[PDB]
RNA sequence: GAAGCCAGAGGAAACUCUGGUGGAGGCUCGCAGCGGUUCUGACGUGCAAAUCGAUCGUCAAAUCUGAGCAUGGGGGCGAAA
RNA sequence: AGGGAAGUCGGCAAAAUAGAUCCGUAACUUCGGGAAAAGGAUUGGCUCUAAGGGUUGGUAACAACCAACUUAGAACUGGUACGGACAGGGGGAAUCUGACUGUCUAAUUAAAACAUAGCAUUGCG
RNA sequence: GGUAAACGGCGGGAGUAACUAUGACUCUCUGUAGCCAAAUGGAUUAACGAGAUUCCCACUGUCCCUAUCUACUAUCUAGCGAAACCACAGCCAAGGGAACGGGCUUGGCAAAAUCAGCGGGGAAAGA
RNA sequence: GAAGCAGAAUUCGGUAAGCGUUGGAUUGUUCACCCACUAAUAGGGAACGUGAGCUGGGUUUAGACCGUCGUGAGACAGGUUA
C-alpha cells in the first residue's frame, strides 16, 4: 500500500530518480551532496541506516535488513543492474552525436 | 474573624482575592468554604468575573480573575515561566527550555524524567521525546510537544523549582 | 496573627523528589 | 485473556520465573436487531400530522420482543423529564 | 496544476488512516489497564521445497494403503498499482466534567440530569 | 433538665473581687529538599464518554480562485393535474403638520401579447 | 500657492470623489489594538430616528449544574452547557 495515493504524483511528493542513485553508487561525492542536503537530525535512526538503492532511510539495522529481503529492494536492483535511462541513451536512441573537434 | 469583630459596626465585610493568575485564589476560597464553590483549572484565566461566595454571616469573599501589571523589565519568557499565558497558543515553545533549565536544578530533571547525558536543551527534548515516543511521521523527534509537556510540568507543580530567600 | 507552625506541614511527594 | 490445571528451571521449605492449557468478564471491534449523536443534509401544501440518506451508540446483558393478566384520573405508572 | 487552514465564531464539510503478518510501543495507574498506544518493514503471479496425519500387519525406529487444510522458506517474473473492486481506526499533548455498564423529556434539549454499587442516619420484637 | 449538637452562633489565651447560669474588670497575642507517622503523605483520582475547550503532525478546493465531468430534476412535448394567498390593483421623485402612503397634488413619463430565471419591494412564519 | 523650500524627502494650504483605498494575528472580551505589503491602506449614508437574504454575540421557552438571596415554592450580582 502506498500512503495518500492521490497526491503520489505531485512534485511536494517526488522521489530521487534511478539514474541518480546510480551517481551515488559510482561517486561518494554525490551522495555527500544529497547527505548535505538533507538535516540529520531530522532522519529516522539519525541517518545512521540507509539503504542508497531505494535511497530511503530507516529507523534500525533490523529495519534496514528487514528492507532489503523485500521486493520493493529486489526492484531497485533489478532495475539497477537493467540500466538507468539517461541523456546519453537518449540521444544514442536518435542516433545523434556530440562532436568536441 | 478578627476584622469582623473589628468591623462589627457594619453589617459585615468584603475579603476580596487579587494576584497574578494561577496562583491559587479560587483554590483558596473553595479551601476557606471546605467545598467546591469557584472554579478551579491549571490553565491560566479560568476566572474571567467577579464572584461573591458568602463565607459567614458576616464574611463575603470575592473571586477576581488574575492581572499581570505592566512593567518594561518584563519579558514574555519571565511572564510564561511565572503562568500568565497558556503554552498550547505560544509560538516556538523550545526557546522556553533554557530558562525552565537554568531555574530547574539538573538533578531534578533527571530524577523527574529518567534521563541523563544531555549537552543541551534540544538535545534534552531529542533524547525525551525518542524516550517518550513523541514522533511525527518519519520518526522524528516532536520537539514542541515535549516543549509544551516539560513547560506544562513545570507551570502545574509536577517539576520541582523554587526562588531562595535572600540572606539577612 | 499568632505563631507560625509550619512543623506538621507535609510537603509534595514529587517525582523528583525521590533518590 | 480471570480462576483452575500441566511441564521445566530454581528456592531448606513458603514461594519465584519461563512455556503451555483454560475460556470468566453488567470487557472490547463489529453483522442483524434495538436506539437516535452529527450534517449551514434531503424533505417543508413531504412517501410521512416526525419520513429518507450518510454518519453514530450498543450488540450476550440493567439486551430486544409476542400473547394472557394487573394497576384507571381526587388516580395509576415513573432509572424523576 | 502551485501553496497547504492564509477560509471560518469555530478544520463545518471533505481528504487522509484502515484487512492481515512481523519489529516495536511512553506518561499515568485502582497494577486490572492505557494499547490496535506512538513509530516502522512487507502484501501480486508462477514454479518449487520443508513441516504439521489416519488405518492394517509379529529397530514395527518397518512396509502397504488413504486423506485434508494450514504454516514457513527459496528461485523466477509483470508493475504506474499488488487488503489493485469490495470491505475497512486519522493519530497525539492536555484542561474541565460525571466513577464506569445503564435510563429519560415518543414529535426541538442524551447531558455535569436520573439510576447504580458503596457509605451514613432514623423507626419497628 | 440532657442532646442529631442537625441548624446555628462563636478571634484567642490567662487570671481574679463576682462566685451557679450571662459572668464582669484587667493583662497580652504576631530542606534545592526536613521532621513525624504503618510503601504512602493522595482530590493535580486511573479507566470509561455520540459531554464542553485549546493546540501539534498528517491531510486535503476551507481558501487564493475558480474550472470541468456524470445522473436526476429544472426546459420542451403527450397524458394527468392541485393548493397557499386574493378589498381593488400593481413604475418612480418631491409634497401630503398627527415623522405613514399605492389611490390625493405637482412632476418624470408612458405602446399589444409573451417565455425562462431572480429574490429589491407588496404578498409569504399553524406570526 | 507658501515655508531655509539648495537637491532629496518634505510641512502647511487650495481646486478636485475621474480612479483606487489590501493581506493577517489576537475572544482569560466593551474584540479593539498590533504586524506587514503598498501610491494610500480617508471618513460616512442608503439599517442602527423599531422592524422576513445567510450566519456568530446583547439574547433570555421547555432539560441541567455552581454562586447570592429566601423557611420554601423560587427569584437573581451572576457563571456554564445543549
Ligand atoms: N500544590 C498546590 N497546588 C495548588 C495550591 N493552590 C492552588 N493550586 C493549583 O493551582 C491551580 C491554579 O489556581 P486556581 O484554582 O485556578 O485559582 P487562580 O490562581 O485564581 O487561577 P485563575 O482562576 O486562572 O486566575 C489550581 O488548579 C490548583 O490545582 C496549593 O496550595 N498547592
Ligand atoms: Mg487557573
Ligand atoms: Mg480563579
Ligand atoms: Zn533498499
Given at each position: 500500500?502506498?500512503?495518500?495515493?492521490?497526491?503520489?504524483?505531485?512534485?511536494?511528493?517526488?522521489?530521487?530518480?534511478?539514474?541518480?542513485?546510480?551517481?551515488?553508487?559510482?561517486?561518494?561525492?554525490?551522495?555527500?551532496?544529497?547527505?548535505?542536503?538533507?538535516?540529520?537530525?531530522?532522519?529516522?535512526?539519525?541517518?545512521?541506516?540507509?539503504?542508497?538503492?531505494?535511497?530511503?532511510?530507516?529507523?534500525?539495522?533490523?529495519?534496514?535488513?528487514?528492507?532489503?529481503?523485500?521486493?520493493?529492494?529486489?526492484?531497485?536492483?533489478?532495475?539497477?543492474?537493467?540500466?538507468?535511462?539517461?541523456?546519453?541513451?537518449?540521444?544514442?536512441?536518435?542516433?545523434?552525436?556530440?562532436?568536441?573537434? | 474573624?478578627?476584622?469582623?469583630?473589628?468591623?462589627?459596626?457594619?453589617?459585615?465585610?468584603?475579603?476580596?482575592?487579587?494576584?497574578?493568575?494561577?496562583?491559587?485564589?479560587?483554590?483558596?476560597?473553595?479551601?476557606?468554604?471546605?467545598?467546591?464553590?469557584?472554579?478551579?483549572?491549571?490553565?491560566?484565566?479560568?476566572?474571567?468575573?467577579?464572584?461573591?461566595?458568602?463565607?459567614?454571616?458576616?464574611?463575603?469573599?470575592?473571586?477576581?480573575?488574575?492581572?499581570?501589571?505592566?512593567?518594561?523589565?518584563?519579558?514574555?519568557?519571565?511572564?510564561?515561566?511565572?503562568?500568565?499565558?497558556?503554552?498550547?497558543?505560544?509560538?516556538?515553545?523550545?526557546?522556553?527550555?533554557?530558562?525552565?533549565?537554568?531555574?530547574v536544578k539538573q538533578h531534578?530533571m533527571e530524577r523527574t524524567?529518567?534521563?541523563?547525558?544531555?549537552?543541551?536543551?534540544?538535545?534534552?527534548?531529542?533524547?525525551?521525546?525518542?524516550?517518550?515516543?513523541?514522533?511525527?511521521?518519519?520518526?522524528?523527534?516532536?520537539?514542541?510537544?515535549?516543549?509544551?509537556?516539560?513547560?506544562?510540568?513545570?507551570?502545574?507543580?509536577?517539576?520541582?523549582?523554587?526562588?531562595?530567600?535572600?540572606?539577612? | 496573627?499568632?505563631?507560625?507552625?509550619?512543623?506538621?506541614?507535609?510537603?509534595?511527594?514529587?517525582?523528583?523528589?525521590?533518590?
Amino acid at each position: 500500500g502506498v500512503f495518500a495515493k492521490r497526491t503520489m504524483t505531485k512534485t511536494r511528493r517526488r522521489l530521487r530518480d534511478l539514474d541518480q542513485i546510480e551517481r551515488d553508487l559510482r561517486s561518494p561525492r554525490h551522495l555527500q551532496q544529497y547527505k548535505e542536503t538533507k538535516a540529520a537530525e531530522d532522519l529516522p535512526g539519525l541517518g545512521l541506516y540507509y539503504c542508497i538503492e531505494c535511497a530511503k532511510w530507516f529507523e534500525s539495522e533490523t529495519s534496514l535488513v528487514g528492507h532489503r529481503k523485500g521486493k520493493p529492494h529486489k526492484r531497485r536492483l533489478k532495475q539497477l543492474k537493467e540500466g538507468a535511462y539517461t541523456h546519453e541513451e537518449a540521444m544514442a536512441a536518435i542516433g545523434y552525436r556530440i562532436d568536441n573537434g | 474573624r478578627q476584622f469582623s469583630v473589628l468591623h462589627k459596626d457594619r453589617k459585615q465585610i468584603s475579603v476580596g482575592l487579587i494576584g497574578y493568575p494561577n496562583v491559587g485564589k479560587s483554590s483558596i476560597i473553595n479551601a476557606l468554604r471546605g467545598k467546591a464553590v469557584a472554579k478551579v483549572a491549571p490553565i491560566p484565566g479560568e476566572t474571567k468575573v467577579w464572584q461573591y461566595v458568602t463565607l459567614m454571616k458576616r464574611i463575603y469573599l470575592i473571586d477576581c480573575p488574575g492581572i499581570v501589571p505592566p512593567n518594561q523589565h518584563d519579558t514574555p519568557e519571565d511572564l510564561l515561566l511565572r503562568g500568565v499565558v497558556r503554552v498550547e497558543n505560544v509560538e516556538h515553545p523550545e526557546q522556553y527550555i533554557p530558562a525552565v533549565l537554568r531555574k530547574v536544578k539538573q538533578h531534578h530533571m533527571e530524577r523527574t524524567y529518567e534521563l541523563r547525558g544531555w549537552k543541551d536543551h534540544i538535545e534534552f527534548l531529542e533524547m525525551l521525546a525518542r524516550k517518550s515516543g513523541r514522533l511525527l511521521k518519519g520518526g522524528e523527534p516532536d520537539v514542541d510537544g515535549v516543549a509544551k509537556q516539560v513547560l506544562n510540568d513545570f507551570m502545574r507543580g509536577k517539576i520541582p523549582w523554587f526562588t531562595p530567600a535572600p540572606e539577612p | 496573627m499568632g505563631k507560625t507552625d509550619l512543623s506538621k506541614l507535609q510537603t509534595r511527594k514529587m517525582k523528583g523528589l525521590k533518590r
